[PDB]
Design a binder for this molecule. Structure first.
Ligand SMILES: [Zn+2]
Lengths: 139, 843, 473
């Protein structure tokens, strides 16, 4: 009832601190936003479907948007790098109780986004090199 | 191998950091921080396993080049490096603690500036701010370095050469570099005291600094004059004031040729306009440690030459602006009149009332016929505010050299000033700007009050006609002055003990109020809110007052207890700079000076003059021993002397001053309670502190303490210094180790551990309250009270706020605070201090 | 000045020093403020005018400052002090008896413009009081409430309620040592803290700080507890009281100690800093009397003393140290002693209420640490507190940027989800089951619109019954 809304707030504040999203200095030397990540990671251990399903939609929007300019691109490369690093720790730290209860999500929500990075990418010599390394670890 | 290899690495790298700037310097600094941490851990581990801790010459030659690099980073333009470099200072303190656990004298001997270094680390734990804000904190810390060393003294001289080359490139060749220059200059001004003591490198920094004050450079000239004025006024180290006042004077004395005719040059005007701004800031702020240096030199002859120069500028928009600022400096100079030194104060104050009353011409702006000459109105306001301050308690003196007799000459002089103020008073009538005339008229009536108050005999006749004036507000003021004069006896008349004896009786009873639980709210409140610059005055007044009432123990118990419990330094903290320490210095210096003179005087006469000791030496260092000297002969003589001095001290328990037994007891109780709330012995610390801080300095240097008329011969000087170490060890209850020179005496010191303790027992065994010994003299101490009543008045507002917060359970409707406001208002404002008849002197 | 220099009177030298010192106090800026002429440099200049024979002055600045009955006390007590000093040197002097009679004639008669002031004077210069007089003062308070709610002319009679409470403060210490009213006057202080007005709340506490103080000198709590002393005398008229609890929402028959702290919490919101410190003293004083009955060192944690220790948490340094959170002597939130579900639900509600209104960085830090720690120690009953924490946390999660204030909050979130998925055993309406459904409302900020809560009609009947039970005639 009430606490469900508390989780959304931690999830929502994750979006509005990605560099592509306007940087309003809420990072406060990145200490504040750093704490929000770790709290979000811990919640995954008990609400696995909600946090994960929250992060696919966040990633789905970042990929599917248009930007122009060298400065803007550096942000998009940097923002997606954070999402995958965070998305892997949620999976990695899950208790190994064979919690295989996500059949519906993967087939049409998460995989069609991870497979996107693994395609042989000629957009950048170095940028795509590090992402494909990051997306492989998650897959 | 580790200490030789590790230090050699440090020597090489620490030499490159000071060599010149590099792109990666900030990074090498962070790495260097961690290398020091690792060295500390190994030392701690090694010390536990075996004390051994080798210190080869390379160890000392690399322990020094490190400090020469932690100072020179304090003015780096980058804010990141400077914040790191302050942190590294803490590691030098820790490495000293490990190397020697005796914080009493070992820690403060390896690392003389231990105390201030601990303050560097704390500041670094603060919110990051701009460059300007941080630099104003680095300087304040640098101003507190006391003892010269090889790190202090070489850092100043090393960065001076860099400073002297940056200036040439900025000037000789017609913004990033200008910010580095501004940092270096602030470094040398703040940390110049160490390098002080003709052609010394410090006296050349000052010379170059008084040429930039008049720098006329087409491109950057303006910024140099502005920063130099700011730094030399607000940031200079107080220990350099005597060298400044004496250098500005010798620069202005060349503007007058023979026969005293001024020489306008359009650059002498620029110099004499910066000097006023420098002297106005340097006087208008109170900095700790300036009390003993501000009053060392006189500034009379410089101030007279400043008024006598601007007197000839003329009338203009510029000249009238210089005259206004010169009048505002005099007003500040008369506020600090009790911290300056005068050779003839009465004639100085008389000879400037004469000068400044010539610019007070009224109606000039109306005659000027100019709208821009509204400034000349401000000059009259400035001149009258200055003249009011010069006349407070000033007897009139006619400049001698004329036939007229003294009494008749003073009367003609009073009339001259009186008629001048009356004429100015008439022109401020409403019929003849409603605010400007209100202020100027108020001052003129406050200057005739001061002139008459000090010259009743000389000028009462000329003033009686003020009682029928046309202005009813002037008649009221004149009839309050006549009331004051009547209430004061014409002369002493032996009426001080009767008329005024009971006037302030209620004042002292208020401060000595035994606040419940013995808290003394007024005394404690007075301690907190008084400015630090006035802490010397407060210690004298409080100690003298309470002792006269036979309550000295009560004051001390509330004074030392806080710091001892507040800080683990306990006895160690009473040797810094703080109110609790200054009360200690006063008690030793005033009550104990006579104790030592009657003790060491006969003994020093024997060794210094007696025939038996005509040809003797006290040199027991084989390395320093001369070929003719015999070690056995030297050792026996030195031992016999220590028997004479040590024996005399023990037998002098009965003559120990009563005033000091209370001080010793408080430390005994305060330290005893400190252990209670936490095999250490209370008497151990009291006796050790007493010996090191009271008796040892007298023995080591008897001449500079007034026990002797001329400096002792070098032979006896060495003997006394060695004897001090032997006497100190006995008090500490320790033996000699690591010093083979003194090892043969470890038997003598051991046999005396008992007798010393019995002595400390006698002095420190007095009752916490003097129930056994009591007397009631109740000194009136009139001259001391006036100083107290003057101190309370000036701090009325701050004292009130402090008391209000506490005593919450019982409101302040009738707490001491409410009694103070009623009593202060009843007594009235304090009098004016009379002119000084001597040079400045201190305790 | 005339008393000092009068010849018909022969004052000793000690007395004349007192009069001369008083003559100086009245000229200070403190007393210029009491008389209402602050902003005036000299009073004499304004009193007279030079052109009185020429023209007639035209009054200006019709705005006039309000007069507070607390200022009349300071004036009425500085003048009483002067009179007494003179009466010592005058045998068989009648000054104080005559002044007392004049005060009575106006105190006990209906006059909207003089009765409030006369009542305050009467209680300051009186040396004796009887039951009959203490009866009439309460009957005036009863009627003032009745008239106040009937019509809109409220401020006129809200001052007559303030002066009546002020007088009872000054007269109780003079009552008979064995009168029943020493205890019944406790329920008058409480009934005055329920009217929700800053001036009535400030005067209500002063009658309670001293009521406890007087009862000690008579040694009534020596072998009993405040709950037994005050609840026994309330028994005869419980029927009227049982209806006041229901509307206010604080049951006194369920948990006396938590109900009383439910009234003293609103005192942290008072604008005056000097009244916030007064309510802190009362909390200290009540803690001492309850533990002493148990001989429990004055800081032990138990069912009786848990309520007072929660309130003092954010103000007293000693309480924090003596009762510190376990996961850093004893520790608050002990599950070995705080076993009853009710007593561990009235402790969390107090801790959540304090944060909801607090707006200080330091204060919020200390309280969120205890709530975060309490989430793991009382998982079952914590969800009865979500609403009091819901709104403010939601904002704090988003916009906060303070690591010190952010770590404890995250601890709360991590603990709610982990213990979720279990059916709700205790709901948010658990407190209403046994009365305390008004604890979180009563402690809110004072209302700007000064309106009687409109259940004062019950208080009027309660006082009416009180007089009959203990003052039959
Ligand atoms: Zn001289």
């Amino acid at each position: 009832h009430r606490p469900v809304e508390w989780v959304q707030a931690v999830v929502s504040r994750f979006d509005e601190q990605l560099p592509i999203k306007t940087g309003q200095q809420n990072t406060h030397t990145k200490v504040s936003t750093e704490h929000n990540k770790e709290c979000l990671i811990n919640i995954s251990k008990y609400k696995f479907s909600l946090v994960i399903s929250g992060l696919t939609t966040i990633l789905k929007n970042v990929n599917n948007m248009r930007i122009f300019g060298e400065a803007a691109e550096k942000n998009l490369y940097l923002s997606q790098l954070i999402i995958l690093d965070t998305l892997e720790k949620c999976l990695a730290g899950q208790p190994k109780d064979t919690m295989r209860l996500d059949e519906t999500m993967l087939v049409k929500q998460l995989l069609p986004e991870i497979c996107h990075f693994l395609h042989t990418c000629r957009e950048g010599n170095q940028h795509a090199a590090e992402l494909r390394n990051s997306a492989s670890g998650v897959l | 191998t580790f200490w030789e290899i590790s230090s050699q690495m440090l020597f090489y790298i620490c030499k490159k950091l000071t060599s010149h700037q590099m792109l990666s310097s900030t990074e090498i600094l962070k790495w260097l921080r961690e290398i020091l941490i690792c060295r500390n851990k190994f030392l701690l581990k090694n010390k536990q396993a075996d004390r051994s801790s080798g210190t080869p010459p390379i160890c000392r030659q690399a322990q020094t080049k490190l400090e020469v690099a932690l100072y020179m980073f304090l003015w780096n333009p980058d804010t990141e490096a400077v914040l790191v470099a302050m942190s590294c200072f803490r590691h030098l303190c820790e490495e000293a603690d490990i190397r020697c656990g005796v914080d009493e004298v070992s820690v403060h001997n390896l690392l003389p500036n231990y105390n201030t270094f601990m303050e560097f680390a704390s500041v670094s734990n603060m919110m990051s701010t701009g460059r300007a804000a941080l630099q104003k904190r680095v300087m304040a810390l640098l101003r507190r370095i006391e003892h010269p060393t090889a790190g202090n003294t070489e850092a100043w001289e090393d960065t001076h050469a860099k400073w002297e080359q940056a200036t040439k490139l900025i000037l000789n060749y017609p913004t990033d570099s200008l910010q580095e220059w501004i940092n270096m200059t602030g470094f040398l001004c703040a940390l110049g005291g160490v390098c002080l003591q003709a052609d010394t490198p410090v006296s050349k920094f000052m010379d170059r600094l008084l040429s930039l004050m008049v720098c006329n450079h087409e491109k950057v000239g303006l910024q140099i004059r502005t920063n130099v004025k700011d730094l030399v006024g607000l940031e200079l180290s107080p220990a350099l004031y005597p060298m400044l006042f004496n250098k500005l004077k010798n620069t202005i004395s060349k503007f007058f040729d023979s026969q005293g005719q001024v020489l306008l040059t359009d650059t002498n005007t620029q110099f004499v306009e910066q000097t006023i701004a420098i002297m106005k800031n340097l006087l208008d702020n109170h900095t700790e440690g300036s009390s003993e240096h501000l009053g060392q030199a006189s500034i009379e002859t410089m101030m007279l030459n400043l008024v006598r120069y601007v007197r000839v500028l003329g009338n203009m928009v510029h000249a009238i602006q210089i005259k206004t600022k010169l009048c505002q400096l005099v007003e500040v100079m008369m506020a600090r009149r009790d911290d300056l030194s005068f050779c003839q104060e009465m004639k100085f104050r008389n000879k400037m009332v004469e000068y400044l009353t010539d610019w007070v011409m009224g109606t000039s702006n109306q005659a000027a016929d100019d709208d821009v000459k509204c400034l000349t109105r401000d000059l009259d306001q400035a001149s009258m505010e200055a003249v009011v301050s010069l006349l407070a308690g000033l007897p009139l003196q006619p400049e001698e050299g004329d036939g007229v007799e003294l009494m008749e000459a003073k009367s003609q002089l009073f009339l001259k000033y009186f008629t001048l103020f009356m004429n100015l008073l008439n022109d401020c009538s409403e019929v003849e700007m409603s605010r400007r005339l209100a202020s100027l008229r108020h001052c003129t009536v406050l200057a005739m009050s001061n002139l008459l108050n000090a010259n009743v005999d000389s000028g009462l006749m000329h003033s009686i006609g003020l009682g029928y004036h046309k202005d009813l507000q002037t008649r009221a003021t004149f009839m309050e002055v006549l009331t004051k004069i009547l209430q004061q006896g014409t002369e002493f008349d032996t009426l001080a003990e009767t008329v005024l004896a009971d006037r302030f009786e209620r004042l002292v009873e208020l401060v000595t109020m035994m606040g419940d639980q013995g808290e003394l709210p007024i005394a404690m409140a007075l301690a907190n809110v008084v400015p630090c610059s006035q802490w010397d005055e407060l210690a004298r007044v409080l100690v003298t007052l309470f002792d006269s009432r036979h309550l000295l123990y009560q004051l001390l118990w509330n004074m030392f207890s806080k710091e001892v419990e507040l800080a683990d330094s306990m006895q160690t903290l009473f040797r810094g700079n703080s109110l609790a320490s200054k009360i200690m210095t006063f008690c030793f210096k005033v009550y104990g000076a006579t104790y030592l003179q009657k003790l060491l005087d006969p003994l020093l006469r024997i060794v210094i003059t007696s025939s038996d000791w005509q040809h003797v030496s006290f040199e027991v260092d084989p390395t320093r021993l001369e070929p003719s000297e015999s070690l056995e002969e030297n050792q026996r003589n030195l031992l016999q002397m220590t028997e004479k001095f040590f024996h005399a001290i023990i037998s002098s328990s009965s003559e120990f001053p009563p005033q000091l037994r209370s001080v010793c007891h408080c430390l005994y109780q305060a330290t005893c309670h400190s252990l209670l709330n936490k095999p250490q012995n209370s008497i151990g610390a009291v006796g050790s502190a007493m010996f090191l801080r009271f008796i040892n300095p007298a023995i080591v240097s008897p001449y500079e303490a007034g026990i002797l008329d001329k400096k002792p011969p070098p032979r006896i000087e060495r003997g006394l210094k060695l004897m001090s170490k032997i006497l100190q060890s006995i008090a500490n209850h320790v033996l000699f180790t690591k010093e083979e020179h003194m090892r043969p005496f470890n038997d003598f010191v051991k046999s005396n551990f008992d007798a010393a303790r019995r002595f400390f027992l006698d002095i420190a065994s007095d009752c916490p309250t003097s129930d056994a010994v009591n007397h009631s003299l109740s000194f009136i101490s009139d001259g001391n009270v006036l100083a107290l009543h003057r101190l309370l008045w000036n701090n009325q507002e701050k004292i009130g706020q402090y008391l209000s917060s506490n005593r919450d359970h019982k409101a302040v409707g009738r707490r001491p605070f409410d009694k103070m406001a009623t009593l202060l208002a009843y007594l009235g404002p304090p009098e004016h201090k009379p002119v000084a008849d001597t040079h400045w002197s201190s305790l | 000045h005339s008393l000092c220099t009068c010849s018909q009177l022969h004052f000793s030298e000690e007395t004349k020093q007192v009069l001369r010192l008083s003559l100086t106090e009245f000229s200070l800026p403190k007393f210029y403020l009491l008389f209402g002429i602050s902003k005036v440099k000299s009073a004499a200049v304004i009193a007279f005018r030079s052109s009185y024979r020429d023209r007639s002055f035209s009054p200006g600045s019709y705005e006039r400052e309000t007069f507070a009955l607390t200022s009349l006390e300071t004036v009425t007590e500085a003048l009483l002090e002067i009179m007494e000093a003179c009466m010592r040197d005058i045998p068989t002097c009648k000054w104080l008896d005559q002044w007392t009679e004049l005060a009575q004639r106006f105190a006990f008669q209906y006059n909207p413009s003089l009765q409030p002031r006369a009542l305050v004077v009467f209680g300051c210069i009186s040396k004796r009081v009887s039951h009959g007089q203490i009866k009439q003062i309460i009957r005036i308070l009863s009627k003032a409430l009745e008239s106040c709610l009937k019509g809109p002319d409220t401020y006129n009679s809200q001052v007559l309620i303030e002066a009546t409470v002020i007088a009872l403060t000054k007269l109780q210490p003079l009552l008979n040592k064995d009168s029943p009213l020493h205890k019944a006057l406790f329920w008058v202080a409480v009934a005055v803290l329920q009217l929700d007005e800053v001036n009535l709340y400030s005067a209500g506490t002063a009658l309670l700080e001293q009521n406890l103080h007087t009862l000690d000198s008579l040694r009534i709590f020596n072998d009993k507890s405040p709950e037994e002393v005050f609840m026994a005398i309330r028994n005869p008229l419980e029927w009227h009281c049982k209806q006041m609890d229901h509307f206010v929402g604080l049951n006194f028959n369920s948990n006396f100690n938590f109900a009383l702290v439910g009234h003293l919490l609103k005192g942290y919101r008072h604008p005056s800093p000097a009244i916030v410190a007064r309510t802190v003293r009362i909390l200290h004083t009540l803690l001492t009397l309850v533990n002493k009955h148990r001989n429990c060192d004055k800081f032990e944690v138990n069912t009786q003393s848990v309520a007072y220790l929660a309130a003092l948490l954010t103000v007293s340094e000693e309480v924090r140290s003596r009762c510190s959170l376990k996961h850093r002597s004893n520790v608050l939130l002990d599950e070995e002693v705080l076993t009853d579900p009710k007593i561990q639900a009235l402790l969390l509600t107090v801790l959540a209420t304090l944060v909801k209104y607090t707006t200080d960085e330091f204060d919020q830090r200390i309280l969120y640490e205890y709530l975060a720690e309490a989430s793991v120690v009382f998982p079952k009953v914590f969800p009865v507190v979500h609403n009091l924490l819901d709104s403010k946390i939601n904002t704090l999660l988003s916009l906060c940027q303070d690591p010190n204030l952010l770590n404890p909050i995250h601890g709360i979130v991590q603990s709610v989800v982990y213990h979720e998925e279990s059916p709700p055993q205790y709901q948010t309406s658990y407190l209403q089951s046994f009365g305390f459904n008004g604890l979180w409302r009563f402690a809110g900020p004072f209302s700007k619109q000064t309106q009687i809560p409109d259940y004062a009609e019950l208080i009027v009947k309660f006082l009416d019954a009180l007089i009959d039970t203990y003052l039959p005639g």
